[PDB]
A = this chain, B = another copy of it.
Amino acid sequence: TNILAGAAVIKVLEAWGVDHLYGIPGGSINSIMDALSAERDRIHYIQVRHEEVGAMAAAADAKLTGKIGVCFGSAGPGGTHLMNGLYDAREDHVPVLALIGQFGTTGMNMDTFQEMNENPIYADVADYNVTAVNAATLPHVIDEAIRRAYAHQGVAVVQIPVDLPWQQIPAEDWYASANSYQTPLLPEPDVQAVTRLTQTLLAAERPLIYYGIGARKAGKELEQLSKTLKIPLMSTYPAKGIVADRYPAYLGSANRVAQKPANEALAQADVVLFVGNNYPFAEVSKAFKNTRYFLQIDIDPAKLGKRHKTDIAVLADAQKTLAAILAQVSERESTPWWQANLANVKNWRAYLASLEDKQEGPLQAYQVLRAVNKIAEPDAIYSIDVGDINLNANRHLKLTPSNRHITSNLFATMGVGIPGAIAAKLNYPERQVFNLAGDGGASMTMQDLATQVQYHLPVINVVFTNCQYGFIKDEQEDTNQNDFIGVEFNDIDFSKIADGVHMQAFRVNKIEQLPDVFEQAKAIAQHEPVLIDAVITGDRPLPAEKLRLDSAMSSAADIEAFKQRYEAQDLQPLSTYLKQFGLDDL
């Protein structure tokens, strides 16, 4: 007939199906720790080495499974360390609960040790942000935070004065509303609007279907629409793998973490079907500047007409809408536009294969990723950090609907590779998990390699050591007038870092070393984490947003220099293929 409030809080977490949660203890959160300790057989605390990793891992949990991620930080600095993961959750719109320690209510507002008003710290990041002041309502406040975080797809933060969880409350009054949870209703496509949309799409001279992760349930429909109608596909970077990369009319993504065929085609398209997509570069890059008709399908009214003016907007679930389109169309014959794009994709893929297929000499990112592909299981999960790896993984990983990949899509916090892989292995112990990270990003969260060791999480860590912030060096090349600054730095030997945390590891710097090292890693990771430190060149990846290949656009000198720098002697501009099939370049 009494229960400690902290025990009730843990029971609320259990009712909501939380399996694991992350943080670092402190006096200010030791009463939650005490309750966790008693519940260790039913809910699983993961002690991280820096609280940002806990927050990042919580966000990654939710990205992966759709289940609210849970993290905590002790008062003051524990909680402020969560921020990069909390902002990742906000911007990637995934549910996360963050608990923040606080001084007991008898010492709050006394200016005592590490005691401050913590509520304003979290006001900007959080959907729901409260300091608890009563023990008997604390289960409700946690319940409320969870329910809001789910409903609103974002972060709920509760600051908990440490006395409250040690107070007895009536056993029979508290409850969880987990039993009542439901996911949002999937609205239906208006029949006449879909018919009009379909007519406009079919009348297009140079159509494209351009989807994001809002279409993640619709890969079959996307590929069949493409095949039936002879309409190429392109996607946001995060939507890579929804349709298998091998599909010959998959163009890739646009902008910079991009593939050449997608940029080139988008510039020529007259009609775009923009589906489940909130591409953030739309306006700033003038992506749709010459698009004649723009057709949008999205579940969120806040998105309709956001990125360009729509000619037809459908507020509906992507898969229901795409299914409705598919059900009212029949097979169309080939067109010049279709064949031009198919030929362009083959040329591009041959380029990427030529980089991958080198067998000896100085190691580049491209062969490292080929070596990843060669040991990758069909349902592998990839946690990808932030930098050139997004660009290179987007081009080289061979994904299918069976895979998952995650990064910090929009906040783009470096350091997520390690935490996302921790989360992935916890959620999918029987699936192969990679952490693909640059040296700058791996550096930021390197201590939590120890967490993979501690919890025996068999992640395959691959660090891309260029001794640079390469992504930023290339930006300075593009914009800055004075010499590079802050973008070239000393080596860190991550094989030695791994040794220090008691993780098996390898360092390689030559292409010919890859096959055996990756086989060894593949086998180690049947039981324990492993790290490969790939010492790679400073070669810049081909900039798909700065092509110098079309005689009509670029000087001979510039073309020659581009081909030489990027080993791109066999790449053709899309206009070559347009011209073969009798179309103008526009």
Contacts and interface: CB of A to CB of B under 8 A. Distances in A.
A34 B502 contact: no
Nearest to A114: B412
Contact of A306 (B25, B120, B144): B144
B497 A500 contact: yes
Interface residues of A, number: 134
Nearest to A124: B120
A228 interface: no
A501 B496 CA distance: 8
A485 B45 contact: yes
Contacts of A188: 184-187
A537 to B, nearest CB: 20
A350 interface: no
A168 interface: no
Given A30-B476, A316-B185, A151 B301 contact: yes
A49 interface: yes
A129 interface: yes
A109 B304 CA distance: 17
Interface stretch (A58-66, A198-206, A332-340, A487-495): A487-495
A84 interface: yes
A120 B117 contact: no
A77 B81 contact: no
A3 to B, nearest CB: 13
Contact of A186 (B26, B116, B117, B187): B187
A179 interface: yes
Contacts of A281: 112-113
A453 B25 contact: no
Interface in A120-150: 120-121, 123-124, 129-134, 136-137, 140-141, 143-144, 147-148, 150
A357 to B, nearest CB: 32
A143 B109 CA distance: 11
A47 B447 contact: no
Given A108-B133, A120-B123, A301-B182, A469 B296 contact: no
Contacts of A134: 105-106, 108-109
A483 B37 contact: yes
A472 interface: yes
Given A91-B116, A123-B123, A177-B305, A485 B33 contact: yes
25 contacts: A27-B475, A33-B486, A34-B476, A34-B480, A47-B486, A50-B444, A81-B84, A106-B284, A107-B137, A108-B134, A109-B132, A109-B141, A110-B280, A112-B283, A114-B410, A175-B309, A177-B310, A179-B313, A182-B190, A182-B313, A446-B446, A490-B501, A493-B499, A495-B500, A500-B500
